[PDB]
Each structure stands twice: as C-alpha cells, then as structure tokens.
C-alpha cells in the first residue's frame, strides 16, 4: 500500500504537469487512460517503503506483554 | 453573534434620522390633525403601494455584519469546553486500551 501511495503521488504530479502543458480541462481518468503504458505496473517498492510502513502504523496484533505471560502461564499449568 | 448584536444596537437610528426624497408632498388642509410624522409615513406608504416594486439592491458585507477580535476574545472568556474535564482521563485511558489491544 505504501508503494501504491508513492507511485500514486508520482502520477498525481504527472497529471498536474500535463494539465499545465496540454490543458487544465483534461480529466484525470481520460489522461491516465490515453497515456496509459505497460510500465504502469511499475509499482516502485524498496526497503525504505517497508521501514516507513512498519514504523508508521499497526505495530502488531498482540505483542507487548499479553502474549508473553499467557504463553508462560499456559506452558506452566500444562504440566 | 455578539458583533452583530453590537452592530444592530449601534445601527438603530441610521435609517430613522435621514430624510426621504423618494416622493414629494405638499401638505395642504393639514389643520385639525395631531399626528404629523405617522401621517407623512402613511402618505409615503400609500404612494409606494401605488408604485410598488419588488427589486432590491445589494449592500457591502462589512456594513451588514463584521467580525472583530475584541468581541472574539470576550467570547473565548465565557468558556464552554465540551469534553468533561473529569471524563477526559477516562476517555484517554479507554482510547489507549482500544488502540494497543484490538
């Protein structure tokens, strides 16, 4: 999703640029349809994308202390 | 609201003092009548009824209503914080518990 966001902001630049170049009335969907290329799939991804995503949101489902003490207690009481 | 209240209070006499030239009046055989200003107004209203029109002209926004900081700060003085001060702590705690778990 972070990758898709970056590429998306890139094209958001592109469209604006062309709107300044060829005409401001060109629709985003029209532009992205006409100038479409096989390289549209170039959803750029890199380590920095992953690190940004990890540090940005969703640390985990259950990480802090819940897992640890249930794990140890459950193993202990299973003897 | 405070600014518009003050403006309305100050503007009460603006439309009353000036004379009206939209129609001209001769005032013959006016003796025996105690009312003077109301009778003039009723004559003007009669003529306007004979010559009534619906169109009206626009006016500058600032002289209808305007916002000023002097009243803004006083309005801020009469505080009304929505969040219950005793409940902000509880809300913060529950929000954090939701955020970290589930």
From Swiss-Prot, chain A:
Subcellular localization, as worded in the UniProt entry: Cytoplasm, Cytosol; Peroxisome membrane
Signal sequence coordinates: none
Highest taxon of the lineage: Eukaryota
Miscellaneous: Present with 1630 molecules/cell in log phase SD medium.
Stated family: Belongs to the AAA ATPase family.
Function: Component of the PEX1-PEX6 AAA ATPase complex, a protein dislocase complex that mediates the ATP-dependent extraction of the PEX5 receptor from peroxisomal membranes, an essential step for PEX5 recycling. Specifically recognizes PEX5 monoubiquitinated at 'Cys-6', and pulls it out of the peroxisome lumen through the PEX2-PEX10-PEX12 retrotranslocation channel. Extraction by the PEX1-PEX6 AAA ATPase complex is accompanied by unfolding of the TPR repeats and release of bound cargo from PEX5.
Quaternary context: Interacts with PEX1; forming the PEX1-PEX6 AAA ATPase complex, which is composed of a heterohexamer formed by a trimer of PEX1-PEX6 dimers. Interacts with PEX15; anchors PEX1-PEX6 heterooligomers to the peroxisomal membrane and mediates their association with the peroxisomal importomer. Interacts with UBP15.
Record note on domains: AAA-cassette D1 is required for interaction with PEX1. ATP-binding in AAA-cassette D1 is required for attachment to PEX15. ATP-binding and hydrolysis in AAA-cassette D2 is required for release from PEX15 and proper function in PEX5 dislocation.
Protein name: Peroxisomal ATPase PEX6
Organism: Saccharomyces cerevisiae (strain ATCC 204508 / S288c)
Shown stretch of the complete protein: 952 to 1030 of 1030
Curated annotation (Swiss-Prot), chain B:
Induction, as annotated: By oleate.
Source species, domain of life: Eukaryota
Location(s), subcellular: Cytoplasm, Cytosol; Peroxisome membrane
Described function: Component of the PEX1-PEX6 AAA ATPase complex, a protein dislocase complex that mediates the ATP-dependent extraction of the PEX5 receptor from peroxisomal membranes, an essential step for PEX5 recycling. Specifically recognizes PEX5 monoubiquitinated at 'Cys-6', and pulls it out of the peroxisome lumen through the PEX2-PEX10-PEX12 retrotranslocation channel. Extraction by the PEX1-PEX6 AAA ATPase complex is accompanied by unfolding of the TPR repeats and release of bound cargo from PEX5.
Family, similarity comment: Belongs to the AAA ATPase family.
Subunit description: Interacts with PEX6; forming the PEX1-PEX6 AAA ATPase complex, which is composed of a heterohexamer formed by a trimer of PEX1-PEX6 dimers. The PEX1-PEX6 heterooligomers associate with the peroxisomal importomer via interaction of PEX6 with the peroxisomal membrane anchor PEX15.
Note: Present with 2100 molecules/cell in log phase SD medium.
Entry remark concerning the domains of this protein: AAA-cassette D1 is required for interaction with PEX6. ATP-binding in AAA-cassette D2 is required for interaction with PEX6. ATP-binding and hydrolysis in AAA-cassette D2 is required for proper function in PEX5 dislocation.
Protein name (record): Peroxisomal ATPase PEX1
């Amino acid at each position: 999703l972070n990758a898709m966001s970056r590429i998306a902001r890139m094209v958001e630049k592109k469209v604006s640029q062309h709107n300044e170049l060829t005409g401001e009335n060109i629709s985003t969907r029209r532009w992205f349809d006409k100038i479409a290329t096989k390289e549209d799939t170039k959803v750029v991804v890199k380590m920095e994308d992953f690190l940004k995503a990890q540090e940005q949101l969703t640390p985990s489902v259950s990480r802090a202390e819940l897992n640890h003490y249930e794990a140890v207690r459950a193993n202990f009481e299973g003897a | 609201l405070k600014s518009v209240h003050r403006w309305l209070s100050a503007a009460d006499q603006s439309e009353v003092v000036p004379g009206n030239d939209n129609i001209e009046y001769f005032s013959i055989n006016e003796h025996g009548r105690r009312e003077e200003n109301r009778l003039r107004l009723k004559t003007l209203l009669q003529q306007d009824v004979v010559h009534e029109t619906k169109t009206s002209t626009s006016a500058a926004s600032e002289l209808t209503a305007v916002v000023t900081i002097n009243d803004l700060l006083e309005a801020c003085q009469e505080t009304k914080p929505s969040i219950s001060t005793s409940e902000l702590v509880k809300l913060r705690g529950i929000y954090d518990r939701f955020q970290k778990d589930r």
